[PDB]
Design a protein that fits this description.
The structure is cut from a larger assembly and holds chains A and B.
Chain A: H1 23-77
Chain B: H1 2-7, H2 11-27, H3 31-46, H4 55-69, H5 72-84, H6 92-104, H7 110-122, H8 127-139
Classes of the chains: A mainly alpha, B mainly alpha.
PDB class: hydrolase
Keywords: ATPase, snare, hydrolysis, translocation, exocytosis, neurotransmitter release, synapse, membrane fusion, hydrolase
Entry title: Min22bin20S complex (NSF-alphaSNAP-2:2 syntaxin-1a H3:SNAP-25 SN1), non-hydrolyzing, class 27
């Protein structure tokens, strides 16, 4: 009558982490810095676009003025 | 060219020209001019909303030059830079230079090599940095 039976106990392997808290924090800090740099680039790019738009009008005005002056001088000369 | 540009308050081009001049002077073993230019450029860029993030790098370069002149000079320069720029105390360059100083203070070459390799693994070193590091290693 040496017929034995058993029961079982369970253990849980550690969840997936303990490497997600050293590279993670550095990743977040770098992401924040990149976000700030992107915001600054946004602002600078908008300012540059405004300045180019401003330049356009003066360019067109000088072109028109020179063309009209040349035509007038030619007309009077002949 | 740098003097001409600075005469017209052209800071960016003058800074780039001074950077090239300091680099070439360092290549020729003229450490004083290189450190002076690097310190000036770093201080100038510290007070900008865009260039601020680069202010660390220049300092590191200057610090390397100090290591060529002497050890305690480099340590004092590091202390001065950290006091002037507290955020410099978290950058990888400061940690690398601290580790190199610790290894170099006890005639330890193995730890020097391990730290150099560990840092180079993350980012590839350029000819200037690797040559300066080889010189420092050859010193002792």
């Amino acid at each position: 009558d040496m017929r034995n039976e058993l029961e079982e106990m369970q253990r849980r392997a550690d969840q997936l982490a303990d490497e997600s808290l050293e590279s993670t924090r550095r990743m977040l800090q770098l992401v924040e810095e990149s976000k700030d740099a992107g915001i600054r680039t946004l602002v600078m790019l908008d300012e540059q676009g405004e300045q180019l738009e401003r330049i356009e009008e003066g360019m067109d005005q000088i072109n028109k003025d020179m063309k009209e002056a040349e035509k007038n001088l030619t007309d009077l000369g002949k | 060219s740098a003097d001409y540009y600075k005469g017209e308050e052209s800071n960016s081009s003058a800074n780039k020209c001074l950077l090239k001049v300091a680099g070439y002077a360092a290549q020729l073993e003229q450490y004083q001019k290189a450190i002076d230019i690097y310190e000036q450029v770093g201080t100038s860029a510290m007070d900008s909303p865009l260039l601020k993030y680069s202010a660390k790098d220049y300092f590191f370069k200057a610090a390397l030059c100090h290591f060529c002149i002497d050890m305690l000079n480099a340590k004092l320069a590091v202390q001065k830079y950290e006091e002037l720029f507290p955020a410099f105390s978290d950058s990888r360059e400061c940690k690398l230079m601290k580790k190199l100083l610790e290894a170099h203070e006890e005639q330890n070459v193995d730890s020097y090599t391990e730290s150099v390799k560990e840092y180079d693994s993350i980012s590839r070193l350029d000819q200037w940095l690797t040559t300066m590091l080889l010189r420092i290693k050859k010193t002792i």
